[PDB]
Ligand binder design. Structure first.
Ligand SMILES: *[C@@H]1O[C@H](CO)[C@@H](O)[C@H](O)[C@H]1NC(C)=O
Ligand SMILES: *[C@@H]1O[C@H](CO)[C@@H](O)[C@H](O)[C@H]1NC(C)=O
Ligand SMILES: *[C@@H]1O[C@H](CO)[C@@H](O)[C@H](O)[C@H]1NC(C)=O
Ligand SMILES: *[C@@H]1O[C@H](CO)[C@@H](O)[C@H](O)[C@H]1NC(C)=O
Ligand SMILES: *[C@@H]1O[C@H](CO)[C@@H](O)[C@H](O)[C@H]1NC(C)=O
Ligand SMILES: *[C@@H]1O[C@H](CO)[C@@H](O)[C@H](O)[C@H]1NC(C)=O
Ligand SMILES: *[C@@H]1O[C@H](CO)[C@@H](O)[C@H](O)[C@H]1NC(C)=O
Ligand SMILES: *[C@@H]1O[C@H](CO)[C@@H](O)[C@H](O)[C@H]1NC(C)=O
Ligand SMILES: [Ca+2]
Ligand SMILES: [Ca+2]
Ligand SMILES: [Ca+2]
Ligand SMILES: [Ca+2]
Ligand SMILES: [Ca+2]
Ligand SMILES: [Ca+2]
Ligand SMILES: [Ca+2]
Ligand SMILES: [Ca+2]
Ligand SMILES: [Ca+2]
Ligand SMILES: [Ca+2]
Ligand SMILES: [Ca+2]
Ligand SMILES: [Ca+2]
Ligand SMILES: [Cl-]
Ligand SMILES: [Cl-]
Ligand SMILES: [Cl-]
Ligand SMILES: [Cl-]
Ligand SMILES: [Cl-]
Ligand SMILES: [Cl-]
Ligand SMILES: [Cl-]
Ligand SMILES: [Cl-]
Ligand SMILES: [Cl-]
Ligand SMILES: [Cl-]
Ligand SMILES: [Cl-]
Ligand SMILES: [Cl-]
Ligand code: NA
Ligand code: NA
Lengths: 361, 291, 361, 291
């Protein structure tokens, strides 16, 4: 281990802190310099033109802690390029051209407290891409194309302080994401595609509300203001909160389009019960054949369609049957055991409505 | 004065890894009995163990969330103590992990969802469960057992696992949980919130045809426009059907007005215009006869 | 024309300047407000969440001059949405999600002195997209994915002051681009993929070179520093200029890799003469058949392959013959007129080298 | 003293829209004749009309770029005037636009490119042109006619339209233009720059085989590796060939070392290893005989 102190030709390395520093920032590098002392604790490559991270570049660096690639051209990172750094606590990839997060990317990282991806072009993240790092204090995805992220891996990080999703395309946030997650100060959803938001105790602590002469703090900071909110009873819990007005606006339903979210009274947030539009009254097909049952119901929000076997409880994806998203029912092998009266049920936050179909085989 | 007595005691329970469990212990006495929960010979303390007193003050409820196996596997003890007496009850908690789940263990096929009901109306919290044998459904509101007893009262549990609250109060709103129990263990559904909002009454008008479908006579090969309009509060969806065949898909269902434009039909059939709303369905007939 | 003064509900409209102002900036709109007085000279929609520009939005606005859509979510602009504004001198689309510039986009614009597209995702620009505005003083494409732009339309704007291509993927700049250009102050190519740069009198006036005691103003500002320069005689004219050192770096040839461009002495900028690698010695095929002639030559830079008919000046893509990029020759209909000795010539800035192939039919 | 005299006079010219044109007029006299260029009866002035004096001082050159039709169509007049005399010459310029170009008009098939030559070496500026009839090629350096005269001198024009400069001076560098002229008109090639750089001499080594291809004997069905290495300055490309069949594509040509690994060849053939450089080509024979 004992050796001289080597420095890249174009960089400046400092021994001043007991941590070895290698400062390559703003040196006009087109690639990661080949000669860097593997004992470097702090490596600054930021504000360079490097387009590619080879595995050789960051390989066999034990003591690296801060690594800043920010403001580079990087469009590609070789898998396991970062496998080597077991002590890396912060990685700044921000302001780069990365369009994807591969599952082997960050597959050596562990003790990482900051992963900064902000201001990249990423359209997708691999399902297992974040599985290797559960210890992240901060995950910054800001300013990307992401439609969704691997949420089940996000809730597996219990140390997460701030999650910045702002300025993305995100469709929705799963309900049970933050349920058992704690110690979370901040969440930024601004400038996204979210129609609704799931309730959560953290979001109950996002508000500041108190009686006169008493002051209630805000333990959670939340900004959803940039989204095309679909404003109905599902957002009522959010409307009942006492918060600042960030000028979030309701896109839908058409009655509320253009109205500011906090200006609308609580009573005007309205969801509507299910109504069954279409059905198959009676059906006759023999045993062991392809069968199809149509039930389609409308409402605000669009109701959930479930089925009920004759004198029975519930169907599902299973060995003898399959259910779909649009409501159709496929019994692949029909049997005389299935002859009878099936019930179609449609559920909504406002209510539920049922119809009946009859099946003879 | 009077030594305590156990009005209700817990039962042996079995649950999954990450699930929850509840032990209900309530007592009577003068003085009011002090309810204690013990793991082995010491009062239970941990981040996941939460005791919930009853609004009556008769007792409390021990709730363990989430379930950690085998940290929580042990015998537990309810203790009802007061001035003149101390009495005890024991129950056993076993927790098996996610790969140890046998087939037939209670599984929640459809859990409760968000529900918003106007005050003094009927709210129905749905639940569906299965297993071998068929599991029994019980309900918990705000970590407390819901009283479904057939004794005359507001809250009533249905034939389906769904719970029904007529004439909804403001105190009815909270976190509801569906609980499936059988010989194989106990399973809790994902929690769901019931929101109780103030009553807003608005005139509700059933659907009536503003323009009923007009009987039209066109010789074969032609194309005609039949105007069918319906009105109401809510404004009903308008749909055309030939017999049982829906002539418009559910994706586009014009609310105000639906016109039927026929293509080169040289045979004869009777067409039906339908108007559907939550207030009931109305359907009228338009007769196209080809000569 | 005489009418009241209408204002969007959520905006603030000012009559203070004889130009009618409508200021919607930072109002949280999800869409362009339907009610805007068509007499508006200055319209600020900036810092809003609009995702779509409909034709109806900007339609029948005669007097509009400044229109700022900056810092919006716009991913789409309906064709001829801007057909209506003949008096628009400036359009700020910057900081948006646009991935394409359609030909019908900006197909109504004329008098435009500023088109600001910077900080968008554009990967492509239609060939005729810029044909409608030849009057542009400033075209800012900065921070995009562009591999190339419609140069022949760029040279058709003779009033162009500043062209900012910086932080793009641009491959190369055509040689005869800037000959027609005049009154051009600034060109920013920084952070691009350019290997070389074409000579030009403007680039000859980009340098500051003077004797001691004399200060030289730079009439033309040019920044190429962010590129993977291929450093050979083709860049020698650039190396002979006296300019500041912006820390541009040579990516190639391998001998110069990593070297700073201005540190390398002029004599070390080396291009190499052509060398013919492959040939077809003799060929026999009859008349009216598919024929192929292989000539492939290497060098730095890669030499230009041309052909010589027996006792003839040269060939071309034509009725009787076709030439390709890789150097292969296809005579689709061979004739006895084509029987003879063909000469293959490969040209380079360093020199040229020839070989001979013989053809009998 | 002596009234002037026309040593060279312009000629009628025809060009395209956007092209250029040059009229060469030089005179002799004592005093030196003042050369004037007139459009109609007035000296030419415009942004596109640029007069270029000769280094001799004998005369000037009128260059019109670009050509604007029909603004520039007119008769033009060179005037040589001095103390004791004034004399004149006329020439007509016609300019036709891009769609008026007849077939056979001079077209430049291959124009000159950037060329960098070491001092006191041979630089060759290429040009190719075609048309009916075959056009004549003339050259212009820095808006001045290049003197290609066979009178003993440095600059010489080749059988091809290419211009050749032996023993390149520093004053040789500049902007060169190829000019094709015939009965149909005159067309200029795109301008190209010649860069003259200082002479750097390095030792040049023709290719020699460092490891010549080794004759190998392997019975049929086997696989062998033949090591062929060549050296030189420049280091030659190494390529394998069976007869006339190139065994490596031009995309990957190993500079240092090329090895031939043979696959299951059960017949017999003689293999050739080749090393190519700008200093020439060397080829050696590797023999594989199957038994
Ligand atoms: C790490 O890699 C470097 C170079 O790749 C090597 O010199 C060093 O020995 C390696 N360390 C270990 C522990 O193998
Ligand atoms: C059930 O199947 C449908 C399609 O057949 C699929 O979209 C859905 O995700 C499945 N759900 C489960 C819980 O397997
Ligand atoms: C429902 O989905 C199935 C496939 O999942 C498709 O084949 C069918 O056409 C759909 N029907 C409707 C009415 O959407
Ligand atoms: C259906 O149409 C036929 C002829 O078009 C008619 O005879 C019959 O009465 C119609 N149906 C009813 C229920 O009137
Ligand atoms: C401009 O369009 C609007 C609506 O599209 C219309 O009301 C108005 O008359 C039009 N003005 C002119 C001058 O065409
Ligand atoms: C000649 O052929 C090349 C490719 O085969 C093509 O790109 C080029 O446009 C052709 N030239 C003309 C004048 O069409
Ligand atoms: C050369 O290019 C032509 C078309 O441009 C193609 O058909 C041919 O395969 C190419 N040959 C090689 C060796 O790349
Ligand atoms: C080719 O190979 C044969 C047999 O191996 C040999 O006799 C002949 O001499 C070789 N060719 C030359 C030119 O040596
Ligand atoms: Ca060291
Ligand atoms: Ca892996
Ligand atoms: Ca930290
Ligand atoms: Ca994946
Ligand atoms: Ca949006
Ligand atoms: Ca019902
Ligand atoms: Ca007005
Ligand atoms: Ca158009
Ligand atoms: Ca201006
Ligand atoms: Ca196009
Ligand atoms: Ca680059
Ligand atoms: Ca030669
Ligand atoms: Cl910095
Ligand atoms: Cl690279
Ligand atoms: Cl960048
Ligand atoms: Cl007592
Ligand atoms: Cl614990
Ligand atoms: Cl009512
Ligand atoms: Cl602003
Ligand atoms: Cl929209
Ligand atoms: Cl944005
Ligand atoms: Cl005299
Ligand atoms: Cl002019
Ligand atoms: Cl020499
Ligand atoms: Na950069
Ligand atoms: Na924005």
């Amino acid at each position: 281990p004992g050796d001289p102190q080597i420095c890249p030709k174009r960089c400046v390395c400092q021994i001043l802190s007991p941590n070895l520093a290698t400062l390559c920032a703003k040196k006009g590098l087109l690639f990661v310099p080949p000669n860097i002392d593997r004992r470097t604790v702090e490596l600054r490559l930021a504000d360079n033109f490097v387009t590619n991270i080879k595995r050789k570049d960051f390989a066999n660096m034990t003591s690296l802690v801060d690594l800043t690639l920010s403001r580079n051209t990087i469009s590609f990172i070789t898998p396991h390029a970062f496998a080597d750094l077991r002590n890396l606590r912060a990685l700044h990839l921000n302001s780069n051209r990365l369009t994807k997060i591969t599952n082997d990317m960050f597959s050596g990282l562990s003790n990482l407290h900051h992963l900064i991806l902000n201001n990249n072009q990423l359209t997708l993240i691999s399902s297992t891409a974040f599985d290797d790092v559960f210890a992240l204090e901060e995950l910054d995805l800001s300013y990307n194309n992401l439609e969704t992220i691997p949420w089940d891996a996000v809730e597996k990080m219990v140390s997460l302080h701030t999650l910045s999703l702002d300025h993305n395309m995100i469709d929705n946030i799963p309900k049970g994401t933050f349920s058992h997650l704690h110690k979370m100060t901040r969440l930024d959803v601004t400038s996204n595609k979210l129609q609704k938001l799931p309730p959560d105790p953290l979001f109950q602590r996002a508000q500041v509300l108190a009686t006169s002469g008493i002051i209630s703090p805000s333990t959670f900071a939340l900004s959803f203001g940039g989204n095309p909110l679909h404003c109905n009873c599902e957002l009522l819990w959010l409307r009942r909160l006492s918060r600042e007005d960030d000028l979030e606006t309701c896109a839908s339903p058409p009655l509320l389009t253009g109205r500011y979210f906090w200006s609308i009274p609580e009573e005007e947030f309205l969801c509507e019960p299910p109504l069954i539009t279409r059905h198959t009254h009676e059906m006759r097909v023999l045993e062991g054949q392809r069968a199809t049952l149509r039930c389609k119901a409308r409402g605000d929000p669009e109701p959930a369609i479930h089925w009920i076997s004759p004198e029975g409880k519930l169907i599902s994806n299973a060995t003898r049957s399959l259910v779909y998203d649009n409501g159709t029912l496929d019994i692949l092998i029909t049997t005389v055991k299935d002859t009878g009266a099936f019930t179609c049920i449609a559920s909504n936050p406002a209510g539920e409505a049922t119809q009946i179909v009859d099946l003879h085989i | 004065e009077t030594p305590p007595r156990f009005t209700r005691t817990p039962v042996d329970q079995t649950g999954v890894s990450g699930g929850v469990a509840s032990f209900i212990c309530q007592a009577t006495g003068d003085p009011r009995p002090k309810i204690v929960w013990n793991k082995k010979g010491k009062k239970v303390s941990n981040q996941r163990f939460e005791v919930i007193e009853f609004d009556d003050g008769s007792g409390s409820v021990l709730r363990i969330q989430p379930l950690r196996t085998p940290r929580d596997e042990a015998i537990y003890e309810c203790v009802a103590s007061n001035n003149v007496g101390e009495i005890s009850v024991s129950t056993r908690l076993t927790v098996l992990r996610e790969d140890q789940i046998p087939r037939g263990f209670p599984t929640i096929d459809m859990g409760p969802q968000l529900k918003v009901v106007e005050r003094t109306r009927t709210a129905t919290m749905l639940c569906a469960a299965s297993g071998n044998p068929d599991p029994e459904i019980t309900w918990f509101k705000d970590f407390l057992p819901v009283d479904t007893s057939n004794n005359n009262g507001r809250i009533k549990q249905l034939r389906s696992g769904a719970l029904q609250i007529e004439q909804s109060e403001e105190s009815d709103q909270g976190k509801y949980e569906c609980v499936a129990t059988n010989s194989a263990g106990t399973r809790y559904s994902a929690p769901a919130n019931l929101y109780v909002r103030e009553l807003r009454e608005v005139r509700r008008v059933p659907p009536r045809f503003s323009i009923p479908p007009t009987n039209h006579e066109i010789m074969p090969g032609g194309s005609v426009n039949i105007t069918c309009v319906a009105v109401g509060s809510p404004m009903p969806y308008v749909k055309w059907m030939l017999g049982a065949e829906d002539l418009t898909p559910e994706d586009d269902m014009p609310i105000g007005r639906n016109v039927l434009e026929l293509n080169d039909v040289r045979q004869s059939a009777n067409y039906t215009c339908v108007a559907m709303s939550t207030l009931g369905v109305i359907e009228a007939i338009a007769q196209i006869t080809v000569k």
